[PDB]
Amino acid sequence: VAGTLRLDLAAYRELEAFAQFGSDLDKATQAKLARGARTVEVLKQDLHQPIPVEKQVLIIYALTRGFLDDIPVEDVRRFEKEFYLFLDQNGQHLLEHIRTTKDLPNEDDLNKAIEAFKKTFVVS
Amino acid sequence: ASLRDIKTRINATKKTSQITKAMEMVSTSKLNRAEQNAKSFVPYMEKIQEVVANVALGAGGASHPMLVSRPVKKTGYLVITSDRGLAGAYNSNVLRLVYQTIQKRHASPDEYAIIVIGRVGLSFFRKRNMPVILDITRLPDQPSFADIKEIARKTVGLFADGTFDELYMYYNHYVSAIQQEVTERKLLPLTDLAENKQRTVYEFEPSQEEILDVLLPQYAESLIYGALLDAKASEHAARMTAMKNATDNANELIRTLTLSYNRARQAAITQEITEIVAGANAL
């Protein structure tokens, strides 16, 4: 999962000056701007709260696969906290699989779980 | 010239070069989007030329004021400029050529009329204390015939033949990216009627001579739209060239700044080392 996010950050970093104007070509450049803002907002973190690697890779996969293009950029932190809570609620099977195999879980089940959480989430 | 000063100038020139390249790309997109609008109006022009090519040469209208006749004598001028600032010579070339032609054709200032689109270039003739008849400042980068319809309706309501008989339009014409040429073409009365093909005879049983008074206002508005699209394309070309030159100059400045920075750093470190070793040996 790391590579796609790395290329996304590399692409967004060079176009930070485009954000002053909406005259941007929407399909590519504005998509890159939205993706970069979402990725940066995800990458922010608080102090003295380490995150386990399973939850890290879960959130990184969710962000990379474009599932967060709909959530407003000013609610991503709350979204992330609620997603961690929900995963602690019923994602224990995926967490155990990741812990014991160092490998991604089944993509279908992962997509189903993230779709369920997205449905149960409320936009502010 | 200090080391940190040169560093600050270097990073500032970096960001400025990035911005100029970005706005050059934006101007590229603008020209690409405006060119299809420029080339999508040609069929309407050819249709008007087809419907008019058999009328004046067909002696349909006798002495219509627009049809090669002089309405009430009042000589006016059309000029179109850009309204988003840094374009280069786009505004200056037309505003200079029109002034030079005016200084030989016009009688005296504060007598003739001017019509300007783009306050950025209008301010020149404002400081040149000219009267503004119709002014258009804000419009989309991709204007439509529907958008220009309001200004066209004003242009046929006032400026009409009962009030105005001569116009000379000045604008920049998209000839190449290196330079957009300026031209001076009169609007009314039409100089001559050219034929696109053989005389396709039509039936005018609605009226033989009462179609001119509506057909020719369309001629004027179509010519106005053509001038507008030429001006917009030329503006985008001017922005292209100006921003390309800006980025090139920024890079050229950057290389020399870095060279001077390296020389300064080497001189500072060598002088400091010499001072330290001399101070140590002095004891």
- Following DSSP, what letter does each residue of A62-94 receive, concatenated? HHHTTTTSSS-TTSHHHHHHHHHHHHHHH-HHH
Instruction: Domain B25-241: give its CATH architecture.
Output: 3-Layer(aba) Sandwich (3.40)
3-state secondary structure of B165: coil
Which of B18, B19, B29 lies closest to A25 in CB terms? B29
Q: In the structure encoding, which two tokens stand for residue B171, read together?
A: 């604008």
Which residue in A29, A32, A33 has the most chain B C-beta atoms within 10 A of its own C-beta, making it the best mutation to test that interface? A29
Q: In the structure encoding, which two tokens stand for residue A56, read together?
A: 């890290």
Which of B20, B70, B6, B37 has its CA nearest to residue B225? Answer: B37
d(CA B26, CA B239): 10
Query: To what resolution in angstroms was this structure determined?
Result: 3.3
Chain breaks in chain A (C to N over 2.5 A) after: none
Which of B227, B225, B144, B151 has its CA nearest to residue B182? Answer: B227
Find the closest chain A residue to B19 by CA distance: A17
Is-contact B37 B236, C-beta < 8 A? Answer: no
Which residue in B14, B20, B21, B26 has the most chain A C-beta atoms within 10 A of its own C-beta, making it the best mutation to test that interface? B26
The neighbour count for residue B228, using CB atoms within 10 Å, is: 24
Q: In the structure encoding, which two tokens stand for residue A26, read together?
A: 């929407």
d(CA B157, CA B151): 10
Which of B179, B66, B81 has its CA nearest to residue B135? Answer: B81
Helices (H) and strands (E) counted in chain A, each on its own, are: 6, 0
Residues of B in contact with A25 (CB under 8 A): 29
d(CA A42, CA A69): 12
Phi and psi at residue B117, in whole multiples of 5°? -115, 120
B11 touches chain A (CB under 8 A): no
B29 touches chain A (CB under 8 A): yes
Residues 6+ apart with CB under 8 A from A81: none
8-state DSSP, B242: H
Q: In the structure encoding, which two tokens stand for residue B272, read together?
A: 């400091």
Q: In the structure encoding, which two tokens stand for residue B230, read together?
A: 């030429």
User: Bridge partners of A97?
Assistant: none
Residues 6+ apart with CB under 8 A from B30: A23, B141, B236, B239
User: How far is A17 from chain B, CA to nearest CA, in Å?
Assistant: 7
Q: In the structure encoding, which two tokens stand for residue B1, read together?
A: 């010239």
d(CA B69, CA A1): 77
B181, B182, B185, B187 alpha-carbon torsion, rounded to 10°: 110
B134 touches chain A (CB under 8 A): no
Find the closest chain B residue to A26 by CA distance: B29
B32 touches chain A (CB under 8 A): no
Phi and psi at residue B182, in whole multiples of 5°? -100, 150
Residues of A in contact with B22 (CB under 8 A): 17-18
Is-contact B57 B193, C-beta < 8 A? Answer: yes
Q: Tell me the residue type at B31.
A: L
Helical residues (DSSP H) of chain B, grouped into ranges: 3-39, 42-52, 90-105, 119-127, 145-157, 212-281
Give CA separation, B31 vs A9, A59, B206, in Å: 30, 41, 43
User: How far is A36 from chain B, CA to nearest CA, in Å?
Assistant: 18
Residues 6+ apart with CB under 8 A from B144: B37
Which residue in A16, A20, A23 has the most chain B C-beta atoms within 10 A of its own C-beta, making it the best mutation to test that interface? A23
B196 touches chain A (CB under 8 A): no
- What approach was used to elucidate this structure? cryo-EM
Is-contact B193 B53, C-beta < 8 A? Answer: yes
User: Whats the size of chain A, residue-wise?
Assistant: 124
Which of B62, B57, B45, B60 has its CA nearest to residue B203? Answer: B60
Residues of B in contact with A23 (CB under 8 A): 26, 29-30
Q: Do A21 and B26 touch (CB under 8 A)?
A: yes
For chain A, report the end-to-end CA distance as a whole number of angstroms: 29
Q: Do B22 and A18 touch (CB under 8 A)?
A: yes
Give CA separation, A71 vs A75, A79, B94, in Å: 7, 8, 50
Which of B49, B60, B78 has its CA nearest to residue B190? Answer: B49
> How does A25-63 read in b/e, with b if 16+ C-beta sit within 10 Å?
eeeebbebbbbbbbbebbeeeeeeeeeeebbebbbbbbb
d(CA B99, CA A81): 67
Which of A119, A85, A99, A116 has its CA nearest to residue A57? Answer: A99
DSSP string, B8-72: HHHHHHHHHHHHHHHHHHHHHHHHHHHHHHHHTSHHHHHHHHHHHTTTTTTT--SS-STTT---S
Residues of B in contact with A18 (CB under 8 A): 22
Which of B18, B29, B30 lies closest to A17 in CB terms? B18
Cβ neighbourhood burial of B188 (10 Å; 0-12, 13-18, 19+): buried
Pair type for strands B76-80 and B113-117: parallel
d(CA B247, CA B243): 6
- The residues spanned by each domain of chain B are 25-241
Is-contact A97 A105, C-beta < 8 A? Answer: yes
B26 touches chain A (CB under 8 A): yes
Q: Tell me the residue type at B228.
A: L
Q: In the structure encoding, which two tokens stand for residue A95, read together?
A: 């967490």
User: Whats the size of chain B, residue-wise?
Assistant: 283
